Amino acid sequence: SGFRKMAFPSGKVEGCMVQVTCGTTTLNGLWLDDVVYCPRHVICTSEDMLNPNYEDLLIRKSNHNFLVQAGNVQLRVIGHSMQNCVLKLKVDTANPKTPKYKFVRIQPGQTFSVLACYNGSPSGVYQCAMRPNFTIKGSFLNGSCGSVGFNIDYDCVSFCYMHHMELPTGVHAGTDLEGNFYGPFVDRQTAQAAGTDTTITVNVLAWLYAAVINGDRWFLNRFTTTLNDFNLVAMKYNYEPLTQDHVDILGPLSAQTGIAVLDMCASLKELLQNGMNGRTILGSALLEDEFTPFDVVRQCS
Amino acid sequence: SGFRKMAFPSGKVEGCMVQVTCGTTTLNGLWLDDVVYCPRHVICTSEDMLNPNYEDLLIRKSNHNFLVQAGNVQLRVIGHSMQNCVLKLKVDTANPKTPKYKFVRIQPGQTFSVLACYNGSPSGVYQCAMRPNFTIKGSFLNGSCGSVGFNIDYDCVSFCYMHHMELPTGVHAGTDLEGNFYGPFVDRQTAQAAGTDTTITVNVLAWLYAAVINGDRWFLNRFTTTLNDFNLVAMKYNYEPLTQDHVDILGPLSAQTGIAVLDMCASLKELLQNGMNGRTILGSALLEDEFTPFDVVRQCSGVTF
Numbered sequence A: 001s002g003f004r005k006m007a008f009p010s011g012k013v014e015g016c017m018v019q020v021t022c023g024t025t026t027l028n029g030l031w032l033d034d035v036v037y038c039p040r041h042v043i044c045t046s047e048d049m050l051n052p053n054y055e056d057l058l059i060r061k062s063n064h065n066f067l068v069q070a071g072n073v074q075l076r077v078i079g080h081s082m083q084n085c086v087l088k089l090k091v092d093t094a095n096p097k098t099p100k101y102k103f104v105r106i107q108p109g110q111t112f113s114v115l116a117c118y119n120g121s122p123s124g125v126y127q128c129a130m131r132p133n134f135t136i137k138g139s140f141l142n143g144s145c146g147s148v149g150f151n152i153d154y155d156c157v158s159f160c161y162m163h164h165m166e167l168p169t170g171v172h173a174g175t176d177l178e179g180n181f182y183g184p185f186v187d188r189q190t191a192q193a194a195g196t197d198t199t200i201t202v203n204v205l206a207w208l209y210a211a212v213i214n215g216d217r218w219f220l221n222r223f224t225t226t227l228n229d230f231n232l233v234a235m236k237y238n239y240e241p242l243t244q245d246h247v248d249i250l251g252p253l254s255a256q257t258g259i260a261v262l263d264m265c266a267s268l269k270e271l272l273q274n275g276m277n278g279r280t281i282l283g284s285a286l287l288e289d290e291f292t293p294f295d296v297v298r299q300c301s
Numbered sequence B: 001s002g003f004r005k006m007a008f009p010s011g012k013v014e015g016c017m018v019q020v021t022c023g024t025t026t027l028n029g030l031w032l033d034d035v036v037y038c039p040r041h042v043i044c045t046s047e048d049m050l051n052p053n054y055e056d057l058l059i060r061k062s063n064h065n066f067l068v069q070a071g072n073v074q075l076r077v078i079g080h081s082m083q084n085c086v087l088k089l090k091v092d093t094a095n096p097k098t099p100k101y102k103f104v105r106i107q108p109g110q111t112f113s114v115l116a117c118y119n120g121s122p123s124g125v126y127q128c129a130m131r132p133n134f135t136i137k138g139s140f141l142n143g144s145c146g147s148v149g150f151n152i153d154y155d156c157v158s159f160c161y162m163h164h165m166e167l168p169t170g171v172h173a174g175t176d177l178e179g180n181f182y183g184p185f186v187d188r189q190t191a192q193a194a195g196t197d198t199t200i201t202v203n204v205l206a207w208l209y210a211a212v213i214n215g216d217r218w219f220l221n222r223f224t225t226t227l228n229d230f231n232l233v234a235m236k237y238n239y240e241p242l243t244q245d246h247v248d249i250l251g252p253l254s255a256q257t258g259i260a261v262l263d264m265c266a267s268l269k270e271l272l273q274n275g276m277n278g279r280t281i282l283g284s285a286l287l288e289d290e291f292t293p294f295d296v297v298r299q300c301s302g303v304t305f
Ligand SMILES: C[C@H](C(=O)Nc1cncc2ccccc12)c1ccc(Cl)c(Cl)c1
Pocket: A041, A140, A141, A142, A143, A144, A145, A164, A165, A166, A167, A172, A186, A187, A188, A189, A190, B001
């Protein structure tokens, strides 16, 4: 019993964190095999932030301009290349702690663990979701660039995020491990704003199923709804539309608790209309949207 | 920016998790140097748990009754002994991944990271607080017994908790690493109930300081209060008393934000008597009490491990 926001154990990722210094900028790198991955903005100065030409800046760099430090050992950079917004520094030593890994690009609503680092040193691990507006609500300070987001698939680390920047609202933007940004963001100091965020409806439903599994039932009702009527209501509360894919994905939870998805959707509509009336669900006074259907099944079963 | 419930990096503890099997029971062990620590209830059957004589049950056991597995390697148990509610299995191999460590007993209100394990395999890490009623509101399934709670002090792991059982309300009970339970609990199948829980006041104040550091300041007011008047109000809402030690510990956050502790206490007092009025603090509609003052400073300044 119990329901917590739980991150994956970070050990496999800690053994990959290194410090990358270029000129006056110091950030984090991910050392996998003989390659260190990090945000390409590490090569940027004061003049090259508003409109940097990264290809031109990288051509002017030599391997000796990059200082890579793994613990107390300095790694020798023997090559450099760029893949989208990620810089790849080829090193002379393969990381002996390299776990079984994959690079995966995730979709909005998906969750992952974040290993927040400073100067190549892990300081904390927390749990995030990719927001529908493609930002993440992380907890990061200056120097956290290059910190990674990941999930663990048995004994395999799927790297899905690398932190690049903090937007003016305090939310965070970054890329997958192939350097492609999540969202309409660029690694330039140009005026950028996240779109209006919405609630991940499928995750709220998954979390309501977690609450039922844990013995919470006060919010249940005798109503059901059509998918379209549910979406018309949910949208008025800035909730993401619930697709047939989401209904199917909630199927196992629906079978386990005996409550149909559209039946649970009618409970959610009621909660949006009434609020919680001083009650909590799994110790929370707000509806939680950072647990996917897969997270709820893994944590409850 | 941002404020998350953040656990310590778990790597130093993952390298210590092993699987301990005795008869039909399989749970987790903590392998440090040449000793594996685990709950002594691993030696129990169904009848044994009801009314156990652990000294008598352990005397009947041999080293070969314990099956310890570290990854894919079976460790050889060369000794067994009991310290309070923890069983210590001496093994023939010292754990090469043993970090610098300490065994520490924590106080209620103190927070720690839990590495939830099943079959000696770490599956999740989460941050939680030792409640004033000595339970932890954890997330554990069958097989999680032996999972440990810890903090990281520079590069030294301080082990403070080992999971033993789940109470009928779904909350959790366990011991320090010397086998002494936190709270009035016993490792026997008998009727046990956690006392009425209270809110960790010093932690709520630390979290209000974290919200101010993040720019969320609607709850601040012009007022201050006495520690005496605040505690009278706190007792009424099932809040723990705030001591002069707590006021001193909140000092650096008070200096950083420009909000004296008794000034923040007057904000907390109004929040209790009037509610949030539809507003949230750090995206929460409830007052959060699982971040200590040290946790808020560590996160809002970026201390590494
Ligand atoms: C390096 C910096 C950045 O946003 N860093 C941070 C990352 N995360 C949190 C921070 C909190 C406070 C201050 C800086 C934080 C930055 C600035 C502009 C651009 Cl376009 C890019 Cl790619 C990167």
